[PDB]
Every structure is written in C-alpha cells, then in structure tokens.
Design a binder for this molecule. Structure first.
Ligand code: NPO
Length: 295
C-alpha cells in the first residue's frame, strides 16, 4: 500500500472516533475530523426537504442534472451527518458526473430501527415523485450506510417501487452481531472498527429487536431482484467478512455483484482521498461503475 496509508492509520489510532465515551462526543469527534478535508470552491450545496427527510443536493461543474445518487452516510446508525459526508458526496458526484442527494436520515439511539430505512425509502420515493428516472439513479453508502443501501433496495422492491440502475456499498455493515471470522482475525490491523463499538452502536439502533431483523441486518434479507451492486472493502478490516458474506448472499439471489477487496485498505479509506491515493483511485472506480450502468 501507499506510504500515505501509514499517515491515515496513525491519525485513526489517535482519534479513535468510535471509542469516544458518549454519543455526543462520538458525533462531535467525527464532525471535527471531517472539518479537516478542504471542500472545493466549485461544490454547490443546496438544502432541501426531501419529502419530509432533510437533505442536501451536492453538485459539481460536470454533474449531469438528470443523474442522481441517493447517498446514505455511515456512522453505525448513530453518528455522521450531511457535514461529515459532504466531501465524499462531492468526490462521488465528480467521478460519476452526477448530482448527489445526501440525506440526514434519523439516527439512533434517539430514533431506532426502522427510522433510518423509513427515511431512505421516503427520500427515494420523493426523488421519483419530483421526476427522477430510476434508470438514471443509484443508491450508495458507506459502513452503516452501505447496509442501509441494501435494506433500502429490499424495502423499495417489497413495496413495488421501481429500483435504480445500480447500487454501491463501501465497507458495508450488514452483521449487527459481529460474528464474521475477520471480526477476530483482522482485529489487530483495523485502526477504526472493533467488535465492542460495533455492538454498542447495534444496541442503540436495534433497541432490543432481533439482531438478525432483515432490514437492520441485510445479511438475513431476501436480496432477489436487486440491481447491479459494487461492494468495495479493505482487507485490513474487521468488516471484511460483512462484504464477503453480502457478496455470497447477493450472488446466491441472482444479483449482478462486483466484490472489490482493496489489499491493506482500512475502513471507508475513500473518505481519506484528499491524502490517500487508493481513496481517490477507489472513488474513480465508483464513478466508472455508475457511468457504465447509466449507459
Ligand atoms: O462506520 N460505521 O458505520 C460503523 C461503526 C461501527 C461498526 O461496528 C460498524 C460500522
């Protein structure tokens, strides 16, 4: 891997964003980190009421105005915001030459499951209501948002809603029990995700519901009929086997799934694209994948 990976690993081993002692300190810690990445002057952000879910349109100069990614941020269903993920949103908008709708879906523990999925599906249905075409759309998300991407597609399909052209999962979180082999075998190389913070956030999201509830933990969902799916994941990830098991389940359900394991990469390494060459390379690949499925 690039020497820059050492810099990112050193930052994460000190900031320990998922190990802050309170939910408000976890939220503030991630906001402080995101404030570091310099936002380009050519990014246009427009606040919108996305059918009762707060959102922001993210547009860059070469955004095709009729192509839309609904972007679902990570943060364990507990942290993250429009502010934390607007940089990753604008990088995807640039690579995919599209607009991004970045939504502020309801967070736990204040709003447990299924609030996040009610909000993601509402925002998608609002895009259709306001004239977006499914063949020009995609859903994408990182970590918890990657799991929410799969759950959103399942819920839309089950409601007879037309599905988008493609979807993208970045280090998705789909096993709320942390029972993948890599949760043990990659614990020594993952500077961000470990089983204890995973179970802490799962508890807040589930609020005592079965941890295999399919729309919370889409490892257990019916994935038949989903559109083409890109899963990007790092091999230095306790969540590696979330992606491997998701790929297995989606392929068994007849889905056109691309599993891309990036050697030595850490959790949502794409977020560090300002400094990490592999982050920008991975975002360029997301853009290629989306443009291919919109052709
Ligand atoms: O970044 N995230 O969304 C997360 C946080 C904790 C976890 O166990 C899995 C994913």
């Amino acid at each position: 891997a690039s020497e820059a990976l050492t810099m990112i690993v050193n930052l994460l081993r000190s900031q320990r964003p998922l190990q802050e002692p309170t939910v408000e300190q976890m939220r503030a810690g991630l906001e402080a980190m995101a404030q570091m990445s310099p936002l380009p002057a050519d990014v246009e952000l427009t606040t919108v009421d996305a059918g009762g879910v707060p959102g922001a349109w993210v547009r860059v100069p070469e955004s095709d105005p009729d192509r839309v990614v609904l972007y679902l941020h990570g943060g364990g269903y507990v942290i993250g915001s429009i502010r934390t993920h607007r940089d990753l949103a604008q990088r995807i908008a640039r690579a995919a030459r599209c607009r991004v709708l970045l939504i502020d879906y309801r967070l736990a523990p204040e709003h447990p499951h299924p609030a996040a999925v009610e909000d993601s599906t509402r925002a998608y249905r609002w895009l259709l209501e306001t004239g977006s075409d499914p063949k020009r759309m995609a859903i994408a998300g990182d970590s918890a948002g990657g799991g929410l991407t799969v759950a959103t597609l399942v819920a839309l399909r089950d409601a007879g809603v037309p599905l988008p052209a493609a979807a993208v999962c970045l280090s998705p979180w789909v096993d709320l029990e942390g029972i993948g082999e890599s949760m043990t075998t990659k614990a020594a190389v993952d500077p961000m995700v470990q089983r204890e913070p995973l179970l802490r956030m799962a508890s807040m999201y589930l609020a005592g519901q079965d941890p295999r509830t399919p729309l919370a933990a889409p490892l257990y969902a019916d994935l038949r009929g989903l559109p083409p799916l890109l899963i990007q994941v790092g091999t230095a990830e306790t969540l590696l086997d979330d992606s491997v098991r998701l790929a297995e389940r989606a392929r068994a359900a007849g889905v056109q799934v691309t599993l891309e394991p990036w050697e030595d990469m850490i959790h949502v390494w794409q977020a560090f694209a300002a400094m990490l060459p592999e982050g920008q390379q991975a975002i360029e690949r997301i853009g290629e994948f989306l443009r291919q499925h919109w052709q």
